[PDB]
Amino acid sequence: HHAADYVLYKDATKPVEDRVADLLGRMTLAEKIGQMTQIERLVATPDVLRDNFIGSLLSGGGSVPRKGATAKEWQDMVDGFQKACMSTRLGIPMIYGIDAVHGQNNVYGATIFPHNVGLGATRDPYLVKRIGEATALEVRATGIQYAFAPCIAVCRDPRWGRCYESYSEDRRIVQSMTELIPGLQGDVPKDFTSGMPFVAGKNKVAACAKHFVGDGGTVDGINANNTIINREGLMNIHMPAYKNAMDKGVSTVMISYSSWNGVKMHANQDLVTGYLKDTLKFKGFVISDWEGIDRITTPAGSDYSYSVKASILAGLDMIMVPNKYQQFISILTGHVNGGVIPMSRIDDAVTRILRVKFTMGLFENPYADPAMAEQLGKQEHRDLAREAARKSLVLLKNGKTSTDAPLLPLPKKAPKILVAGSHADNLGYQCGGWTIEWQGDTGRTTVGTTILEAVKAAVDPSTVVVFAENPDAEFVKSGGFSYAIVAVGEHPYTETKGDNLNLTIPEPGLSTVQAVCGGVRCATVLISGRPVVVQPLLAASDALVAAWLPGSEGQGVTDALFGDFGFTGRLPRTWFKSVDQLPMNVGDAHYDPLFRLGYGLTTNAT
Numbered sequence: 354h355h356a357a358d359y360v361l362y363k364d365a366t367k368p369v370e371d372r373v374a375d376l377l378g379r380m381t382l383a384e385k386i387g388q389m390t391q392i393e394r395l396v397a398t399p400d401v402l403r404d405n406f407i408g409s410l411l412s413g414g415g416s417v418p419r420k421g422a423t424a425k426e427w428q429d430m431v432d433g434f435q436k437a438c439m440s441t442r443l444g445i446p447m448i449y450g451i452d453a454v455h456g457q458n459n460v461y462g463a464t465i466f467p468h469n470v471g472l473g474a475t476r477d478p479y480l481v482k483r484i485g486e487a488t489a490l491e492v493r494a495t496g497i498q499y500a501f502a503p504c505i506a507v508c509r510d511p512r513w514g515r516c517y518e519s520y521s522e523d524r525r526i527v528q529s530m531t532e533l534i535p536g537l538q539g540d541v542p543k544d545f546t547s548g549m550p551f552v553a554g555k556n557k558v559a560a561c562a563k564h565f566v567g568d569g570g571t572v573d574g575i576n577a578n579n580t581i582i583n584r585e586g587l588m589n590i591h592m593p594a595y596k597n598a599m600d601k602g603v604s605t606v607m608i609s610y611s612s613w614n615g616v617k618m619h620a621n622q623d624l625v626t627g628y629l630k631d632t633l634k635f636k637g638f639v640i641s642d643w644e645g646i647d648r649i650t651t652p653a654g655s656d657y658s659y660s661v662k663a664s665i666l667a668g669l670d671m672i673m674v675p676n677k678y679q680q681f682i683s684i685l686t687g688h689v690n691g692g693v694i695p696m697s698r699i700d701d702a703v704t705r706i707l708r709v710k711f712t713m714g715l716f717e718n719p720y721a722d723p724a725m726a727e728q729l730g731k732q733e734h735r736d737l738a739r740e741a742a743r744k745s746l747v748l749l750k751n752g753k754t755s756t757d758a759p760l761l762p763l764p765k766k767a768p769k770i771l772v773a774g775s776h777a778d779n780l781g782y783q784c785g786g787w788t789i790e791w792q793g794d795t796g797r798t799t800v801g802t803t804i805l806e807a808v809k810a811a812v813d814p815s816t817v818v819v820f821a822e823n824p825d826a827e828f829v830k831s832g833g834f835s836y837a838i839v840a841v842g843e844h845p846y847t848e849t850k851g852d853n854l855n856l857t858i859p860e861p862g863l864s865t866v867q868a869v870c871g872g873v874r875c876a877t878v879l880i881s882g883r884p885v886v887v888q889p890l891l892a893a894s895d896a897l898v899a900a901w902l903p904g905s906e907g908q909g910v911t912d913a914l915f916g917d918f919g920f921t922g923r924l925p926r927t928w929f930k931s932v933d934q935l936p937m938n939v940g941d942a943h944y945d946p947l948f949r950l951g952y953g954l955t956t957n958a959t
C-alpha cells in the first residue's frame with residue numbers, strides 16, 4: 354500500500370495482527386529477546402536501549418528523574434529513552450510502566466486517590482471507573498503509557514502488608530471494581546472478544562491485572578509466601594476477577610511472587626499457560642514481578658539459568674529484570690541457541706508484546722504530548738478524589754450510649770475546637786504507602802489538604818481552631834473546647850514491611866485519643882490500611898470513623914464530619930475481635946466479628 358520503501362508494520366491503516374506478523378517475520382533473535390526485556394530507568398542509557406533492543410522500561414517505587422520533578426521533566430525523560438529505542442534498525446517503541454495505583458502516585462503534585470480498601474467501602478464501581486479515567490490522564494501527563502494496576506488480590510487475612518491494595522475480602526466486590534480497567538484503558542467496543550488486549554489511544558494507558566494468582570490468600574498473611582487452598586477455592590475466591598479483567602480487555606497480567614500449594618507462580622505452567630492463556634484465552638502479555646524469576650529459587654538468584662528457563666517455559670512473556678539485563682539476555686539467548694527453549698515460545702512472547710504495543714497506538718504516538726502536562730493534579734480530579742475519600746469513610750460509632758445525642762455531624766460554628774493526633778496534620782500518613790516513595794513517607798510530601806487544613810477550610814470564620822498533636826488531659830480540660838477531632842492510626846507501609854501479626858496501632862495514638870476524649874466530646878478518625886485492634890479506641894470515643902488511607906484530599910473527611918454529605922461507606926472486610934481469630938472469614942464457623950462485612954452507620958446531610 355504505496356511508496357517503494359513501504360514496510361507493512363509501519364502502516365497505521367493495517368490490521369494489528371498483520372502488523373504484528375509482518376514485524377515479527379523481520380526480527381532477529383536479539384531483537385526478539387530485547388522486546389521481552391524490561392529494565393529500570395536507573396540502568397538505562399541511549400546506548401543500552403539501542404544496543405540491547407530493549408522492549409520496556411519502568412520506574413519502580415520512588416524511581417524518579419528527581420525529587421519534585423515537573424510533568425514536563427517526566428515527559429522529557431521518557432521521550433529521551435523513546436528516541437533511543439526509535440533509532441534501532443526496526444524502530445520499535447518502548448512501553449514505559451509505573452505503579453500508578455492510587456493516582457500517578459510517584460509524581461509530585463499528582464492527585465492521590467484513596468487506596469483500594471477504601472474504594473471497596475464505596476461499593477461504587479462507576480466512581481472507580483472515573484478514578485481510572487483520571488489516573489490515565491495524570492499518567493499520560495508525565496509521558497507514561499502503562500500502569501501496573503489494578504491489584505485484584507482478594508485479601509483473606511489483614512495481617513498481609515498489601516491488604517489496603519485489595520478492594521475487599523469478598524471476590525464479588527473485587528469483581529465489580531474491575532471497572533478500573535476500562536477507565537484506565539477505555540471501554541472495549543461492542544463486538545469485543547474476551548481476553549484480547551485493548552487501549553483506546555494516546556489519552557489512555559495499558560493496564561495490568563495483578564498479581565496472578567492467590568496473592569491475597571497466603572498463610573498467616575505473609576507477603577509473597579504460600580497459598581494453601583484446593584483448586585476449587587483458588588477458582589472460587591482468587592480467580593474470578595481475572596475473568597472479568599479478560600472480558601474488559603486488560604492488556605497485561607503480572608505474575609505473583611506467591612506460591613500455590615508449594616509451586617512458585619513464576620514457574621507455574623499449568624496456571625500461566627494452561628489456564629490464563631489456553632482457558633481464559635488471554636492474548637495480551639504476561640509480565641513478571643520485580644526479580645520475580647530470581648525468586649523461583651531459594652536462595653533467590655542462586656540459579657538464574659533455571660529461573661530464565663522455568664519462567665519462560667511457564668509462559669511469561671516479558672521479564673521485569675530489572676537491573677541485570679545483560680545476564681538475562683545472555684542466558685535466554687544461550688537457552689534458545691541450545692534448543693532448550695524453542696523459537697515457538699520466543700515468538701509467542703514477542704507476538705503478545707507487539708500486539709499490545711500496536712493495539713494501544715504506540716507506533717503512531719511513541720512520544721509524549723506536552724499539552725497533557727497540565728492534567729497533573731487537576732482540580733476536577735481532586736474533586737473526584739474528595740468524593741471518593743468521603744464515600745470510603747465508614748462510621749463505626751456515633752454516640753456512647755443509645756440515648757446520647759449523635760456527635761456527628763459536628764457544627765461548623767463553635768467558639769473553639771481542637772484538632773489533635775499524629776495523623777491530623779500529616780499528608781504522608783493520610784496517603785499511606787506507594788506515595789512519592791515506595792514505602793510512603795511522613796509529612797508534607799506532595800500537594801494536598803491535611804485533616805487540619807480541611808477543618809480550617811470548613812468551619813465558620815468565628816470558630817477558633819486549635820491544633821495540638823499530642824495534648825495531655827489537662828490541656829484539653831482547660832481549653833474551653835466545644836468538641837475535638839482526633840486522628841491517629843498506622844504509619845505508611847508497603848509489601849513485606851506492612852506484614853503485621855499484632856495489628857495494634859503505634860503509640861502515641863490510643864493515649865492521645867484517651868486524653869482528648871476524656872476532656873471533651875470527640876470524633877476519632879482512624880487512618881489504616883485495614884482493620885486494626887479497635888475496642889480501646891471505641892471505648893474512649895463518642896464517634897469513630899474508619900477513614901482507611903484517603904489520599905491527598907482531606908476535605909473528603911470533613912465533608913462527612915460536618916454534614917455536607919451523609920456517611921454511606923460500608924465495611925468491605927470483616928473487622929475482627931482479636932488477631933488470634935485470624936484468618937476469619939465470612940462464612941467460617943468460628944465467624945465472630947466485631948463488625949461484620951457490610952456494617953456501617955449512616956448520617957443525613959445538614
Ligand SMILES: *[C@@H]1O[C@H](CO)[C@@H](O)[C@H](O)[C@H]1NC(C)=O
Nearest residue numbers: 575577578579611612615651
Ligand atoms: C514462607 O515464609 C517462611 C518463613 O519466613 C519461609 O520458611 C518460606 O520459605 C516461605 N515460603 C514461601 C513459599 O515463600
